[PDB]
Amino acid sequence: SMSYSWTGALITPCSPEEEKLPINPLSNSSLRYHNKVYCTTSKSASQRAKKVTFDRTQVLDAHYDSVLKDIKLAASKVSARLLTLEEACQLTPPHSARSKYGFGAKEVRSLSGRAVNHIKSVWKDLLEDPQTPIPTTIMAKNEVFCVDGKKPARLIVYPDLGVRVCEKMALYDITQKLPQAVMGASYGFQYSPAQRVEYLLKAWAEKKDPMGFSYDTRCFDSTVTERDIRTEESIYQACSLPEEARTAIHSLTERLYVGGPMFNSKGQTCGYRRCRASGVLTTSMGNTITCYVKALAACKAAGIVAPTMLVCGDDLVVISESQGTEEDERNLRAFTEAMTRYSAPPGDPPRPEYDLELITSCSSNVSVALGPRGRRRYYLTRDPTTPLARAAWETVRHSPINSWLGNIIQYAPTIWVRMVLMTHFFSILMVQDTLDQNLNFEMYGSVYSVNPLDLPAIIERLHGLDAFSMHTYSHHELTRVASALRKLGAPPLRVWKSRARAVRASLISRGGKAAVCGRYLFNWAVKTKLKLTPLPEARLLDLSSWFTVGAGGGDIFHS
Numbered sequence: 001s002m003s004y005s006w007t008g009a010l011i012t013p014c015s016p017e018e019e020k021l022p023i024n025p026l027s028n029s030s031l032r033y034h035n036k037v038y039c040t041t042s043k044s045a046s047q048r049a050k051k052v053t054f055d056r057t058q059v060l061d062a063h064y065d066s067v068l069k070d071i072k073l074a075a076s077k078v079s080a081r082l083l084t085l086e087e088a089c090q091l092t093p094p095h096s097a098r099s100k101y102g103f104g105a106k107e108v109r110s111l112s113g114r115a116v117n118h119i120k121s122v123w124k125d126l127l128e129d130p131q132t133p134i135p136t137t138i139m140a141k142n143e144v145f146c147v148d149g150k151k152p153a154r155l156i157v158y159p160d161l162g163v164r165v166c167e168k169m170a171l172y173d174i175t176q177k178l179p180q181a182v183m184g185a186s187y188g189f190q191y192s193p194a195q196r197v198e199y200l201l202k203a204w205a206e207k208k209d210p211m212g213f214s215y216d217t218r219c220f221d222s223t224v225t226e227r228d229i230r231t232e233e234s235i236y237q238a239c240s241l242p243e244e245a246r247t248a249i250h251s252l253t254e255r256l257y258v259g260g261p262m263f264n265s266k267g268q269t270c271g272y273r274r275c276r277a278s279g280v281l282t283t284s285m286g287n288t289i290t291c292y293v294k295a296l297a298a299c300k301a302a303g304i305v306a307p308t309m310l311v312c313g314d315d316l317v318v319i320s321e322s323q324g325t326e327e328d329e330r331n332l333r334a335f336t337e338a339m340t341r342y343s344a345p346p347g348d349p350p351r352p353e354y355d356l357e358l359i360t361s362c363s364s365n366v367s368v369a370l371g372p373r374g375r376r377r378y379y380l381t382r383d384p385t386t387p388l389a390r391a392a393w394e395t396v397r398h399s400p401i402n403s404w405l406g407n408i409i410q411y412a413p414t415i416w417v418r419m420v421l422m423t424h425f426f427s428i429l430m431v432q433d434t435l436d437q438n439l440n441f442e443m444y445g446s447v448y449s450v451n452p453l454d455l456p457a458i459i460e461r462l463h464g465l466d467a468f469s470m471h472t473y474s475h476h477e478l479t480r481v482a483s484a485l486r487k488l489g490a491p492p493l494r495v496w497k498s499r500a501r502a503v504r505a506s507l508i509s510r511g512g513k514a515a516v517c518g519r520y521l522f523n524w525a526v527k528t529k530l531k532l533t534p535l536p537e538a539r540l541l542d543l544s545s546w547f548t549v550g551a552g553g554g555d556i557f558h559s
């Protein structure tokens, strides 16, 4: 079927949109940034709609059936329960898109009578009716990117707030248990960055002769069929569940997850969806499990030898035994053909790599730097141009996503986070006197609440003490940050190191948790290096909820 059908009504915005920051004609830096950075807006929504609209065909085989059989058997070991209304309301982010039925996230979180009873009606109607399509809203996302032309806006398709709370009651427990039970070590959301690196290094070391590849599906959400989505339901149903959960899961699958009508922000009929919805609770878990099933079946069909997989939504990495370059090339072509028959064709054809550092996935690659010992330390990094361009946009135009914060946390050991992002954002929090204010950052369908003064303990827990003592960065990492700073019109590394010496001194001059930030985060900025010891507060952090899938949008709150 067609991934989408359209009426011709425009995908409309709800808030003001800005494609580019204003130019200062007397600044060369301002011109460089203007030439390089843009924000996607609803103006390009039709270009995206055209790309994501195509017919899907699937040809399954015995390899697919056998993998699916094993997944259902692994799912049967899972016992999951309904969440209470109270639990589902507390998982709702404070600024989650309001309901059309006269209440918002504030009323959901406080359990106001009207919100609670409207959610009661949605729940009862899910139990009563297994078939009527649930309406959704389609919106164009506003995201900042760098040229090299321009990407059109990504589209988000989501149901009403009342429906989103019911999805949590019915399926949140499944999201916490099922992926690990069916995928084991392949489930990408269970790892801290240091644990992810360790897993990849172990997978690489296990092979006598390793070969790795990343596989990127073109428009993954649109390639997801009604059948893939009904198969996801049979996997959820393989769990031990109360009957009421089974009923709600089945109605949500048939009325929402498989497809339905889409409306623009003005309330006009925009189209009809027959693929994955980008803004539902099951988006990330569903994409991860479905990508894993197709990829494991395709490994078997291609004859990939001893594959070790890592799956994060539609991002997939396979590390296996090289059969030599010629056979690897043939086997990757056979893998691609099988993924295409399963309705998962590639954007760019996969390429075999004989060095772990040469694989890119989730925009990241493994790099090496020296520890305080002089020992080689491995960490995840990425090209910093877009993260630095987003941080510059966020400095001038406040966003609740706070991409700069999510980047400082995920990429804490990188040169660009330590020298540029930490220096810049610790300076702004100090000048504004907002260091001790809790902030939220959005990432992979989840909203996390973080105190910037807790960053040293969070970084130590996610990356280890090595994050505060990395030095002697690879030439590629040095060239990458220097080029990104030049291209964006920013001052060079030498200016950032001078500013960091002052930010560190100012932080240490405040005492308490701020001095801890100065000492641990900016130990690279000084000549006389302090010996950094484990932070006791690192062990006391409850970061358990940080290692799971979120809800498209992102609609799972962690505080």
Ligand SMILES: CCNc1nc2oc(-c3ccc(F)cc3)c(C(=O)NC)c2cc1-c1cccc(C(=O)NC(C)(C)C)c1
Residues within 6 Å of the ligand: 188, 189, 191, 192, 193, 196, 200, 310, 311, 312, 315, 316, 317, 356, 359, 360, 361, 362, 364, 365, 366, 380, 409, 410, 411, 443, 444, 462, 546, 547
């Ligand atoms: C470290 C940068 N991010 C990532 N970098 C990555 O690099 C790879 C990768 C790269 C090269 C390669 F050869 C193999 C794999 C990822 C991968 O699994 N691909 C299949 C991958 C995933 C995340 C990622 C995704 C979701 C959440 C979080 C997270 O850490 N989240 C918090 C802070 C909340 C715990 C991090």
